[PDB]
């Protein structure tokens with residue numbers, strides 16, 4: 039048994055629900071326009087929780103659902119770009135919160151590709167035969183990284199976390215993968231810059247630290263490069279469902295045409311969550327499993343496709 | 359060929375050299391006292407470079423040394439807790455800087471255990487058979503995370519980066535490993551907190567963001583837990599050299615006694631670098647290889663042991 043397998047899914051978002059109506063007041067825009075530009079109706083925003091707290095509940099819920107003991111966890115991987123501290127890692131805060139004393143843990147930084155990247159990691163870890171049980175969680179609190187006056191980005195993001203319980207299976211589930219990156223375009227999407235202000239620094243680098251994005255640029259990138267990445271693993275005839283990063287539904291609309299894969303196969307759920315970055319795919323996954331669209335153990339050929347800052351992007355082809 | 363192997367080593371530190379004499383003036387302490395408390399005589403501090411720049415030179419040097427093409431790199435892993443941005447990752451900035459268009463990349467957050475953790479990752483990646491050539495670099499610019507007035511921590515850290523070229527070998531090199539963590543003590547060593555100041559935040563969390571450490575606490579932790587972790591892989595009779603995280607030489611003095619492993623086997627090099635966090639082990643490694651203490655391809659049984667914020671710690675047993 040050295041084949042990684044997603045046994046359980048689970049998600050957790052802040053209770054505070056922020057509708058477009060509240061954002062139209064905060065800012066000076068119309069809820070109607072916020073809705074048509076984003077494809078979002080409402081989103082959750084933390085009021086007292088930080089990334090680790092959201093990830094903590096996900097882990098806690100995964101443990102209760104599966105009936106697993108925190109002591110049976112061998113490793114905890116968290117995909118995030120909005121961690122409480124640089125040190126400790128969010129994965130370590132969760133490891134301590136749930137008491138997974140026998141698990142080692144760390145965070146992975148790959149922007150909105152983070153969950154897919156982390157999932158690829160867990161597969162490698164389990165393949166080695168050294169580890170069998172892990173928790174892979176994607177979580178963010180981007181609401182603390184936004185300029186809530188600029189209505190061309192703030193209205194786009196939601197907070198939340200979701201993950202899965204991974205355990206060693208007898209038969210393969212993770213069939214193929216293709217992880218990629220292009221740092222030659224890293225300026226297209228950035229956040230979290232830290233100014234060096236030691237008495238030794240001589241540069242004049244300044245950066246608000248709030249998210250910055252070249253919409254058209256990354257939109258075009260997704261359509262061209264993600265489409266090619268997806269087509270390197272499947273074709274319409276060999277895939278049942280595709281769970282892409284929930285950045286913008288129109289990206290999905292166009293990718294389905296580009297790749298010639300049936301549009302109803304691409305699941306989406308931005309309406310109530312907005313763009314939850316690394317958490318987008320596992321939140322979508324938990325919902326699709328929860329309502330019976332996706333069925334664990336059914337052998338449905340599913341592709342998970344993330345893409346984001348880096349630039350980063352990658353897909354995983356699995357049989358649920 | 360699916361056995362990870364360290365083929366090349368390389369290091370890079372800022373040219374700006376800061377001696378204890380300059381720090382005694384800056385602060386109001388004696389160089390003599392800074393020396394006896396830290397075991398450091400001088401350290402490098404960035405004046406214009408950021409973590410990615412240091413890691414960039416390491417990658418660039420590794421590529422030139424080995425004669426490899428940036429296009430032959432399959433993956434780039436960077437261990438850091440002081441990245442330029444949360445997004446993009448430092449690994450992505452390096453991937454773009456050196457033109458490793460065929461490599462996917464991401465950063466790993468495991469504090470001063472980061473390099474060991476990243477190395478464990480690369481081993482898993484190569485084991486899978488999907489990837490053969492990678493660059494694993496540990497780099498930090500902690501000088502931007504310190505309060506240069508508090509002489510109980512600032513005098514401790516240096517800037518720098520170092521890494522290795524990893525490629526698929528025919529015979530095993532990575533013999534064993536034991537990665538661990540304890541998030542129940544994460545408050546003992548923290549840095550980089552990000553305050554949430556969205557119009558929705560109701561908490562009153564505040565944190566300077568500069569490094570905070572409970573010296574005695576983590577010192578005791580290292581002596582007890584790292585000693586046990588090391589003894590789970592070797593005994594004096596089965597190890598030739600041990601490269602531990604360069605946090606404090608006295609930790610090594612005591613660990614050698616605790617574990618009963620010959621003291622001359624633990625290599626150290628804080629004098630000219632200070633504590634370079636994640637970069638400490640690969641800098642030490644490159645130096646020991648450079649001067650002939652350690653010999654690649656000689657089959658010397660070597661243990662790499664990192665420990666740091668998280669809490670995190672772990673060792674790798676290899677035959678060079």
Ligand SMILES: C[C@@H]1C[C@H](C)CN(c2ccc(C(=O)Nc3ccccc3C(=O)O)cc2Oc2ccccc2)C1
Pocket residue numbers: 075076150189190191193194252253254256257258260285286289313315345346347
């Ligand atoms: C609030 C604004 C409203 C506008 C209409 C859409 N915005 C946009 C929202 C999302 C994207 C986009 O491509 N996003 C992404 C692409 C790759 C990886 C990650 C993302 C991410 O949003 O996290 C791009 C946007 O801007 C354009 C889309 C098409 C053509 C030109 C720009 C969000």
Ligand SMILES: C[C@@H]1C[C@H](C)CN(c2ccc(C(=O)Nc3ccccc3C(=O)O)cc2Oc2ccccc2)C1
Pocket residue numbers: 395396470509510511513514572573574576577578580605606609633635665666667
């Ligand atoms: C500048 C100060 C000078 C004092 C004398 C030593 N400081 C200290 C320097 C380092 C440590 C220490 O244990 N460090 C660590 C332990 C585990 C993982 C990482 C570190 C790290 O420094 O990065 C602890 C220190 O403080 C004590 C050591 C022994 C007993 C009580 C406190 C640094």
